Amino acid sequence: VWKDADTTLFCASDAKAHETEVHNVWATHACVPTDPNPQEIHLENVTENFNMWKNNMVEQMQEDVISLWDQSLQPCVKLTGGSVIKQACPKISFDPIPIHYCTPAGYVILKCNDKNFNGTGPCKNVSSVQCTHGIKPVVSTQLLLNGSLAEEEIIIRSENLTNNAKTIIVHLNKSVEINCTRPSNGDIRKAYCEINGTKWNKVLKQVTEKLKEHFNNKTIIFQPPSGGDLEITMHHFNCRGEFFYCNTTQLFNNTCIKGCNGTITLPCKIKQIINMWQGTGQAMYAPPIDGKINCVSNITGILLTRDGGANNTSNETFRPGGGNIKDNWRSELYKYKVVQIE
Ligand SMILES: *[C@@H]1O[C@H](CO)[C@@H](O)[C@H](O)[C@H]1NC(C)=O
Ligand SMILES: *[C@@H]1O[C@H](CO)[C@@H](O)[C@H](O)[C@H]1NC(C)=O
Ligand SMILES: *[C@@H]1O[C@H](CO)[C@@H](O)[C@H](O)[C@H]1NC(C)=O
Ligand SMILES: *[C@@H]1O[C@H](CO)[C@@H](O)[C@H](O)[C@H]1NC(C)=O
Ligand SMILES: *[C@@H]1O[C@H](CO)[C@@H](O)[C@H](O)[C@H]1NC(C)=O
Ligand SMILES: *[C@@H]1O[C@H](CO)[C@@H](O)[C@H](O)[C@H]1NC(C)=O
Ligand SMILES: *[C@@H]1O[C@H](CO)[C@@H](O)[C@H](O)[C@H]1NC(C)=O
Ligand SMILES: *[C@@H]1O[C@H](CO)[C@@H](O)[C@H](O)[C@H]1NC(C)=O
Ligand SMILES: *[C@@H]1O[C@H](CO)[C@@H](O)[C@H](O)[C@H]1NC(C)=O
Ligand SMILES: *[C@@H]1O[C@H](CO)[C@@H](O)[C@H](O)[C@H]1NC(C)=O
């Protein structure tokens, strides 16, 4: 028997000690080895309540990723709280690895196995585990990359759909590849992401259908982010250590929901000067490495903000972008909660 509790988790990974890649290096020192024979017990006729929006596992993962980034991604110049910090900024090897989140003795993690669980409320099919699945700490905006997929239907998740200020996480049930490249050989910061338009528009159509179920069949309209920093108005992510900013206007194309089944090519740029997602200020990095810089990722989730004040109209307008990296972890941790064992 148990009760919802918070405690300090630890992490486990398969980091390689000989690797210089920074997530490996961090996990080699900050985490223990994974369990090759992990226990998972189904809790017979047990119903548990979960609330992904109030889940300290998220705050803890955020804490780790901040620490990882802080010790791994030194910029040449950091502008924070009005001070200027200068230091060496060598190119690094960067490629996220899965990190498992684990309970210490006297606690356990309950996992909701209801396939269509929306993240808050009762779960009928619950199991207990010592660690979460391995979650890659992929930092991005607008699109969630290399994550886990919903096992059945597309799921719409929100702390309160009625409140337009609350971010919506769209959990996809089918991956769509996004293939980003800064080609080897003009402009060294010019890059692009290629997406399969037929596949992407099919999924986006489905997301639209799902949104209708939640918004009384109102008309669903996508628009580009209203304004803000580039990290939010663009799909922002890190590829091989380089900070990419990609224009997603083409991805949220209302008319495709004409002959538009071809490759979607998003224009991207690599930026040396960025606003740190940690919310701490600005950083400047060295220019991109030479050669073909390339990441192919699965889009597995979408972060959306709904326009407020549209209650009198027959439309609901959505714009890509969540307002919080914690939501990235939320999207992976929603099915977990820590409890204390009696
Ligand atoms: C509950 O979830 C488990 C693990 O995901 C799955 O294998 C099983 O089919 C489900 N069990 C029940 C009682 O439906
Ligand atoms: C999720 O399901 C719960 C059932 O308890 C419901 O109360 C809540 O409104 C739902 N949220 C969404 C976004 O569907
Ligand atoms: C990408 O998604 C595919 C298909 O759903 C999956 O098989 C593969 O593991 C994913 N690759 C990742 C997570 O890097
Ligand atoms: C994904 O979910 C949608 C609607 O939520 C559904 O129509 C479709 O069957 C699902 N696709 C897969 C591959 O499970
Ligand atoms: C959900 O948001 C609506 C609109 O802001 C608000 O009126 C209502 O009180 C909220 N519900 C909860 C439980 O916060
Ligand atoms: C990614 O895009 C480039 C073309 O721009 C191509 O060289 C490469 O083969 C692509 N990779 C995949 C897996 O589609
Ligand atoms: C997208 O995938 C479909 C298969 O559903 C394929 O027919 C098409 O060649 C792909 N489109 C592009 C241009 O990548
Ligand atoms: C994205 O691209 C569109 C069309 O090319 C452009 O008008 C828009 O301003 C771009 N968005 C950003 C934030 O650069
Ligand atoms: C939507 O797609 C069509 C392609 O047929 C194109 O005319 C239009 O420019 C697109 N809107 C975008 C990409 O913003
Ligand atoms: C997604 O995972 C693939 C396979 O490990 C990797 O090549 C790609 O760069 C990852 N994307 C991001 C943004 O980390």
> What single string gives the DSSP state of each residue in 291-318?
S-EEEEEEEEEEEEEEPTTTTSSSEEEE
Instruction: Name the 3-class secondary structure at 238.
Output: strand
Distance, CA of 259 to CA of 267 (rounded, Å) = 20
Report which DSSP code applies to 34: P
> What are the residue ranges spanned by the domains of the chain?
1-342
Mark 209-238 as b/e (b = at least 16 C-beta within 10 Å).
ebbeebbeeeebbbebbeeeeebbbbbbbb
* Distance from residue 161's CA to the centre of ligand 2 (Å): 9
Distance, CA of 43 to CA of 127 (rounded, Å) = 5
* Distance from residue 161's CA to the centre of ligand 5 (Å): 8
> Torsion over CA of 32, 33, 39 and 43, rounded to 10 degrees?
40
| Cβ of 300 less than 6 Å from ligand 3 | no
Question: Which of 279, 281, 217, 226 is closest to 252 using CA atoms?
Answer: 226
Within 13 A of 105's CA, how many CA atoms are on the CB side?
Answer: 0
Are 141 and 305 in contact by the 8 Å Cβ rule? The answer is no
Instruction: Name the 3-class secondary structure at 28.
Output: helix
Are 327 and 167 in contact by the 8 Å Cβ rule? The answer is yes
Decide: residue 195, CB within 10 A, 0-12 exposed, 13-18 middle, 19+ buried.
Answer: buried
Please calculate the CA angle 150-200-262 and round it to the nearest 5 degrees.
160
What is the 3 state secondary structure string of 100-166? EEECCCCEEEEEECCCCCCCEEEECCEEEECECCCECCCCECCEEECCCCCCCCCEEECCCCCCCCC
The token duo for 159 is 């702390």
Please calculate the CA angle 287-240-192 and round it to the nearest 5 degrees.
75
Please calculate the CA angle 206-239-19 and round it to the nearest 5 degrees.
125
Question: Which of 167, 205, 211 is closest to 305 using CA atoms?
Answer: 167
> Torsion over CA of 308, 311, 315 and 321, rounded to 10 degrees?
20
Report which DSSP code applies to 197: H
- Resolution, rounded to a tenth of an Å? 1.9
Question: Which of 280, 318, 281, 290 is closest to 302 using CA atoms?
Answer: 318
| Cβ of 239 less than 6 Å from ligand 10 | yes
Question: Which of 146, 137, 143 is closest to 301 using CA atoms?
Answer: 143
E strand or H helix that includes residue 32 = strand 32-33
What Å distances lie between residue 210 and 110, 199, 207, 219, 263, CA to CA? 28, 17, 5, 12, 25
| Cβ of 174 less than 6 Å from ligand 7 | no
Are 61 and 96 in contact by the 8 Å Cβ rule? The answer is no
Nearest-atom number in ligand 2 for the CA of 119 is 1
Alpha-carbon dihedral sign for residues 14, 141, 229, 167: negative
The token duo for 133 is 């699945």
Q: In this structure, which topology does domain 1-342 adopt according to CATH?
A: HIV Envelope Protein Gp120; Chain G (2.170.40)
Task: Identify which of 175, 176, 179, 297 to mutate to test ligand 6's pocket (most ligand atoms within 8 A of the CB).
Answer: 179
Are 319 and 222 in contact by the 8 Å Cβ rule? The answer is yes
Q: Which long-range contacts (CB under 8 A, 24 or more apart) does 286-291 make?
A: 286/76, 286/89, 286/90, 286/91, 287/188, 287/189, 288/182, 288/188, 288/189, 288/242, 289/91, 289/240, 289/241, 289/242, 290/184, 291/184
Within 13 A of 207's CA, how many CA atoms are on the CB side?
Answer: 33
Residue reference for tokens 């969630």: 144
| Cβ of 160 less than 6 Å from ligand 5 | yes
Question: Which of 282, 256, 287 is closest to 270 using CA atoms?
Answer: 287
Strands 32-33 and 10-13: parallel
Report helix, strand and coil shares of the chain as percent, to nearest 5.
Answer: 20, 35, 45
The token duo for 16 is 């390689």
Per DSSP, what are the bridge partners of residue 295?
A: 180
Please calculate the CA angle 77-82-88 and round it to the nearest 5 degrees.
15
The token duo for 202 is 């099919």
Residues with CB under 6 A from ligand 8: 224, 233-234, 247, 249
Distance, CA of 302 to CA of 168 (rounded, Å) = 8
